[PDB]
Design a protein around this ligand. Structure first.
Ligand SMILES: Nc1ncnc2c1ncn2[C@@H]1O[C@H](COP(=O)(O)OP(=O)(O)O)[C@@H](O)[C@H]1O
Ligand SMILES: Nc1ncnc2c1ncn2[C@@H]1O[C@H](COP(=O)(O)OP(=O)(O)O)[C@@H](O)[C@H]1O
Ligand SMILES: Nc1ncnc2c1ncn2[C@@H]1O[C@H](COP(=O)(O)OP(=O)(O)O)[C@@H](O)[C@H]1O
Ligand SMILES: [Mg+2]
Ligand SMILES: [Mg+2]
Lengths: 73, 57, 456, 456, 456
């Protein structure tokens, strides 16, 4: 197992990027004819970190103050 | 004795069904207050979201 | 002339052109160096146009030169598009090299005029008991598969494609809008292995693609269907999810400088929907028969997007999460589903009386259900006890095993003709099969099978 | 160098400094004519910084000179803080003279690293039947007492201070964040008269205080506790109400120019909690057992502040207004309350089974509530009637008179061991007490007292 | 001096004036060459004022000259307004020529001061038995009127208009807040046919008028009522619907761009209600008493509009569709209708005991009627059957022939005094009339008339 950590005290940018970093580490095996499994323990916490950055960048809010592109995230 | 107890069964059932009808109304009355709170709360939230988006765009 | 990128924010890009060379609304632009296309959505003023990228912006920079093409996105149309997989820009997304096009059309167009509409009620048989009974489809009509998440929209559409497209003598367009890439691969290999890929044009814009791609994929597929309709042909148009078109507009609306409306939707929800939906129609030259899957956010049929969609369709099929939660498929709601062809002057009195008879029995049982929960079954009158039995059986007899669902059901698929659909329900309503246990009607195709399942 | 107040709006102040002398974020600033302290939150550009006042802004004006101190708010730490009362800036507020400090520490720090963490599974007996049963605590872990207004948070905390100071021999740190000033006076004199005061450090920033004080008092208490943890000591950190740290942040958020999030909260809600919550942990050098009361706005557990707090705790105790309305104290919800220590590998199978059994019984009773509400208990099945009877006895046997509540009621307090707690509930579940009236279990401490209460 | 229109956006108009000639808040402005009036709402600064058109804005353009009038909207007051229909500006909407006015008053003023209030509570003798006994009105009080259409609302207003003028030498004013043009024409003819038109002044703000007109009509009618009060009179102010006054304020607040409050109402909701309701009081010269029809949104009594209005109501009169079917035309429900004046410390022990005695008897009879229906009349005791006989006599004695209802009842009208009302009901409760038939107590006026209708 590879363990990727972005704990509660870390920058909202690191919490927003952690799932993509872990996905990239899993994709290494897929692209080379091997099998991998990935667990995202909380995508709802990744969405809350993305909402923070987006509001501080002054982008217009949506359905529960969440960014317009939270589906595409 | 049997026949008189059947008359008692019918009367007892009358009062039980009256109690059940009254109790149902109390539940309906309490739920209606919660529904009105949920109705009013939903409206305020939507307005905040409309105002919030318009204050950015 | 030439323009420079001045402002990139997400999927939205601003390009500044000479004040004498400002590109038109919906005009396509090309970035120099980077392989990216931008469609003008708004003319802000002072030579600047607001556009949406038809690709990724991770490689875009401020000051990159942009070229005006003088027209809107032009996609290939006609016979060359059959048996091919394409993107929003019409590029081939299969390894079979280039497409031999003899003409390109612009994705943006006017809807057929009021004098060009055509009216027809030819009845189209589907092979599904619930639909053939309460939602009779018609050739050249518009069908909508309304439902939330995980209730059967894709599965039901695949069964229809199989029971109609495979037999259909004419051509067909399949548009995957905001679909899972795995479903697109399974369907492509399915059309290819079934030898039917030769008569089906495939356009795919999945969930991994930029908002602009998911916002125009529906216009690309429809432009190909319109070329075939205008040749005088009969065409089938299948759209995987038309909600993704509305959602892509919501995702980009706020960055386009538009104030939000109710339930955080674009203020142009009804017009953006009408502009697409009015082109999907059967005129006096040829007939487009179309099936659209409509996602219902949080299972709430009152949400602005689903609520604005009903008025555009002839047949409305409603899938219920409460029926699916009981192991019943197809999970169509007979009391919420409707069709314009349901009229004694269009079909017949025998069919209509059977349909209204089934609906009457199920509507009355929806109120006795709570009565049975509190108190008990014993406290009901005999007519209510007798009705409760037939309602529970009819609900189960509406279930039909489908060939496309064999992977999930484990059992073989079944096809029921409308005659068997009418016969069985009429008998159950008459009470002829009141001698059969309730468990015998679950997934049993025709009523005959039910009589056999009761013996096992 | 020296700056000038350029703007004042409530508790927030903007100060302009020379471009070569701009203060860093969190740097402390002092106003020359009043000595009011300001904490820098952000740098706006052009030499202008935005700050929050650590006191009242009434009487301040534009153009006043401001001095930068070159460091963040620094507070005294170590043995000199024991038996003393301090404010947010580390000043003494007990009239007992200056603090004999040897060193000062800044109130902003980074959380201990992943490789300095420590695992605590040693059970900490509280003496309360409900907590010892379904919410077992551990040494060096975090506990949260969730509850609405007037339900039991301050009383249920004061009892745990009394029954945990029985086995603990080290130091304690208490941080009063936005609560009653009378309750701080009552607690100080109680410990002074009981001679317990020389082992407790007290920090206060109550409801009477401006937003800047209520926002930083939590950091000042934690900073003193960290000093004791890093000296290799076992410490108890008590936070009077952690929600007020977040609320003080909401009052100031719009003044800091931030766009609001759901229900008016600051966009930075989860980060502010984590930056404070992560530091409250047991490293390898020392341990910080922490108890924090969590207010629940309008009794809504789904509100963003309470909802974001659950993930930061090892044990969650959820108090309820309904349980309190029946007369039960403490009003803990066994079905909503939980702990990381409720594991067969930590507490043993016997305790884990007694708790699983008590929860199973109460859960079924909750499901039968509506039927009994309209038809009464007499229509239930024989087994259901038996469970409803054991569920009711279990409900009242979870009640306990506290030693901090004899003033309110007059009855004497009870301390119940983990052994006696398990024996009482195991007996009621097995049916060994089916012959006692329900009222023999209410406020009886041990089970033997219920047997002697049943004699009347 | 004169200004110029600078911006037009719907009903909101911005006008620019010289720096030495800016008009005041609430000042009325006149557009040159067009019959359009603008009320100033806000002073934006730099010479520009924001106003709301009191009429249509179609055909207006930028640059038109506007003239200041020096005061707020000023309307005709006094005797000349009786028997006339006027708009919000005081113009005669009836084709009866100019109003013979001697004076004009501005519609905006402060409520009477703390020193101007009357020295106690004085009942207003309406001359209607059910109202004077169960719903006593205080002079200077506010009465909420509840019920549907076709239950006698209009006839009750016409009877009150006749009695205040003939029996108390007073006058009436009717404010049609959001009046329906069809109902406004019907009411004018009904009052002419009923010979009450010369006792009342009619002010109408029709539904098709802009939000500013519907918001100010209540102040125009109130200004005419204030004049009569100063004359030395007791006056009746009828407001067609107080909910439409609240909604007009919500509409105007949204047009001016203000941030909305709870449930979407204007932030000024309580202040706008207080400014209107605090002028309606009993002074040291005269007393304006008001009858206001109340609408409840979604049947919710906790909604901000009902909640705010109920805070200013002294009595609640409920008209019942059931009572009307019985044949009691007044149709006021004696159990649901209430008054704050129904207190022995205000109306004396005698009036209070008589009214509470009638309500006690009427309550018991409603319970007994369900018994008589479910189980039968024989199941009742002798005391209960005697009570039923008095309750039926009481119920019919609550009826009364009005002078405006002679066309429907075929009998002459009656004006019963408070003294005669208390004496009549006191006797029936004690049993002094138990020998008379109940019909003898129907449509008679005072109690001596029941005794005479009996001899026959
Ligand atoms: N008729 C059916 N028979 C069996 N499983 C079905 C059926 N319809 C839906 N399902 C189940 O739901 C999924 C497929 O339905 P799908 O079309 O994806 O639903 P939706 O498009 O409404 O999200 C599978 O997991 C399958 O097990
Ligand atoms: N016998 C009791 N046992 C426990 N709590 C009680 C008892 N009687 C009353 N309470 C209430 O418990 C509450 C404990 O503090 P609480 O109000 O929950 O904290 P907070 O002030 O922070 O909101 C007090 O309001 C107290 O009056
Ligand atoms: N006091 C009354 N005496 C006799 N008939 C009445 C009386 N009050 C109401 N009615 C009858 O009820 C009808 C409706 O009353 P009205 O005052 O016009 O109520 P609304 O204005 O809501 O329509 C009248 O036209 C008349 O037939
Ligand atoms: Mg699907
Ligand atoms: Mg408190």
């Amino acid at each position: 197992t590879i363990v990727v950590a972005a704990s509660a005290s870390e920058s909202a940018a690191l919490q927003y990027l952690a799932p993509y970093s872990g996905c990239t580490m899993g994709e290494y095996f897929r692209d080379r004819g091997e099998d991998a499994l990935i667990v995202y323990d909380d995508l709802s916490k990744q969405a809350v970190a993305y909402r923070q950055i987006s509001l501080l960048l002054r982008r217009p809010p949506g359905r529960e103050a969440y960014p317009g592109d939270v589906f595409y995230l | 004795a049997v026949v008189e107890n059947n008359a008692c069964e019918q009367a007892a059932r009358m009062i039980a069904m009256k109690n059940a009808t009254d109790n149902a109304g109390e539940l309906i009355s309490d739920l209606q207050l919660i529904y009105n709170k949920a109705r009013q709360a939903a409206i305020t939230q939507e307005i905040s979201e409309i105002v919030g988006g318009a204050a950015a765009v | 002339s030439s323009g420079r990128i001045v402002q990139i924010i997400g999927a939205v890009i601003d390009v500044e052109f000479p004040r004498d060379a400002v590109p038109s609304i919906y005009e396509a632009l090309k970035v120099q160096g980077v392989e990216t296309t931008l469609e003008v959505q708004q003319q802000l003023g002072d030579g600047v146009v607001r556009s949406i990228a038809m690709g990724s912006t991770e490689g875009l920079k401020r000051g990159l030169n942009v070229d005006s093409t003088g027209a809107a996105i032009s996609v290939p149309v006609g016979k060359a598009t059959l048996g091919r997989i394409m993107d929003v820009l019409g590029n081939p997304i299969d390894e079979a090299g280039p497409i031999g096009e003899e003409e390109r059309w612009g994705i943006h167009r006017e809807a057929p005029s009021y004098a060009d509409q055509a009216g027809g009620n030819e009845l189209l048989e589907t092979g599904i008991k619930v639909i053939d009974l309460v939602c009779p489809f018609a050739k050249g009509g518009k069908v909508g598969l309304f439902g939330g998440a995980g209730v059967g929209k894709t599965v039901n559409m695949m069964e229809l494609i199989r029971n109609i497209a495979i037999e259909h003598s004419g051509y067909s367009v399949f548009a995957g809008v905001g679909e899972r890439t795995r479903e697109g691969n399974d369907f492509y290999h399915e059309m290819k292995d079934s030898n039917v890929l030769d008569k089906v044009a495939l356009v795919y814009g999945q969930m991994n693609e930029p908002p602009g791609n998911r916002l125009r994929v529906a216009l690309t597929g429809l432009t190909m269907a319109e070329k075939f309709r205008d040749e005088g042909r009969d065409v089938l148009l299948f759209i995987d999810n038309i909600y993704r078109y509305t959602l892509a507009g919501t995702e980009v609306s706020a960055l386009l400088g538009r104030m939000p409306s109710a339930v955080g939707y674009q203020p142009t929800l009804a017009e953006e929907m009408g502009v697409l939906q009015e082109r999907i129609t059967s005129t006096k030259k040829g007939s487009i028969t179309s099936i659209q899957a409509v996602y219902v956010p949080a299972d709430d049929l009152t949400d602005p997007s689903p609520a604005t969609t009903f008025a555009h369709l002839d047949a409305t099929v409603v899938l219920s999460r409460d029926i699916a939660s009981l192991g019943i498929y197809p999970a169509v709601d007979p009391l919420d589903s409707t069709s314009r062809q349901l009229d004694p002057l269009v079909i017949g009195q025998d069919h209509y009386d059977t349909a209204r008879g089934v609906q009457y029995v199920l509507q009355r049982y929806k109120e006795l259900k709570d009565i049975i929960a509190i108190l008990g079954m014993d406290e009901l009158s005999e007519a209510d006890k007798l009705l409760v039995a037939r309602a529970r059986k009819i609900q189960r007899f509406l279930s039909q095993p489908f060939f496309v669902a064999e992977v999930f059901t484990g059992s073989p698929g079944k096809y029921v003709s409308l005659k068997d659909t009418i016969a069985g329900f009429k008998g159950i309503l008459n009470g002829d099969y009141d001698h059969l246990p309730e468990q015998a009607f679950y997934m049993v195709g025709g009523i005959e099978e039910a009589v056999e399942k009761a013996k096992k």
